[PDB]
């Protein structure tokens, strides 16, 4: 006596949640590793939290061109790969801490410029690659 429409809606959302849970619990793990093992190796521009940002930019930029011109699949996998994997692997916060850790000024602005423009050229790389290879 729980209303079939609502039962099915909430079950669907539970599967779509399980999706994001798994995608993100892998994406975060990868970033944790790269940061802890590769942030000790430059304080002015920490490359662990930059490697994961560049990598997530590349992946989700590969998949904007992919999951736009290639359907017949599922929002399940789209979601766990986009708002899960590339959200857990990526971060805006761990990059924000070190900028003010430099503020509190040349490398604090280098952090800004490098992070932004490079993780964007990673999206460019991804879109480029995917749309060109299978055009």
């Amino acid at each position: 006596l729980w209303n079939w429409f609502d039962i099915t809606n909430w079950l669907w959302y539970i599967k779509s949640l399980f999706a994001v849970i798994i995608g993100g619990s892998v994406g975060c793990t990868l970033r944790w590793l790269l940061s802890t093992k590769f942030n000790s190796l430059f304080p002015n521009l920490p490359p662990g939290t930059l490697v994961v940002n560049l990598l997530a930019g590349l992946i989700i930029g590969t998949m904007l061109a992919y999951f736009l011109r290639q359907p017949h699949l599922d929002p399940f996998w789209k979601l766990m790969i986009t708002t899960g994997l590339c959200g857990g692997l990526s971060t805006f916060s761990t990059f924000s801490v070190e900028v003010f850790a430099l503020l509190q000024y040349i490398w604090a602005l280098t952090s800004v410029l490098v992070h932004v423009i490079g993780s964007l050229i990673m999206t460019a790389l991804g879109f480029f690659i995917i749309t060109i290879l299978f055009a």
Partner: antibody
Amino acid sequence: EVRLVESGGGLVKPGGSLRLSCSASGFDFDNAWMTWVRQPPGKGLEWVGRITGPGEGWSVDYAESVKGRFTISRDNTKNTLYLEMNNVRTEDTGYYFCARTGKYYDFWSGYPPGEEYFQDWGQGTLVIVSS
Amino acid sequence: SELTQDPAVSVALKQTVTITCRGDSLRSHYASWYQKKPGQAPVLLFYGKNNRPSGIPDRFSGSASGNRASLTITGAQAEDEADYYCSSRDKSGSRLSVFGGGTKLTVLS
């Protein structure tokens, strides 16, 4: 066991009115989703409408060609389903079947609101509509 | 008519035939397959992922892909010469259900 019998078809001139009835037995009537499905003579089956169950507030959904003219209802005490046909067009000719409507949703592949199926059918009841 | 079938299709006796339904909704929702002889009521034959209700012989089997659904009759019998209808949603996410055109099976016996 499970029995559904339709009743009340026959002749009716265009613009008239008619009440088709479905006496149901052999299962929990008071909770089962119910569906009408009619077959015009020499045509395929056409889903008419479906009234929900208790959990859904007795909502009813209608086929587009029928919406506004037909009204589905139920007496869970008398264990009968009702289709009230008002302002009739000759289109609505054909046999009329009440069907017990199972609900289905596989958790993994599903998408709301699942998809309903029709396990048990009546024999029909012939409504003819001509001047 | 959002669900589309080929109107008629035959098969020799003891052979195997498949009726195919097509439509947008079929990508996001499953189907149900109904047998229908004249005068006689429709017979549920299959639905969902892999549900064959009891009594329906093992030789009836449903299938689903991309935008297509299919009823598979393995080992044709003369008592299968009937009409066959797919049934699903009209559009993706609707409470309204809808049947296909139907497919006339001749069992060339």
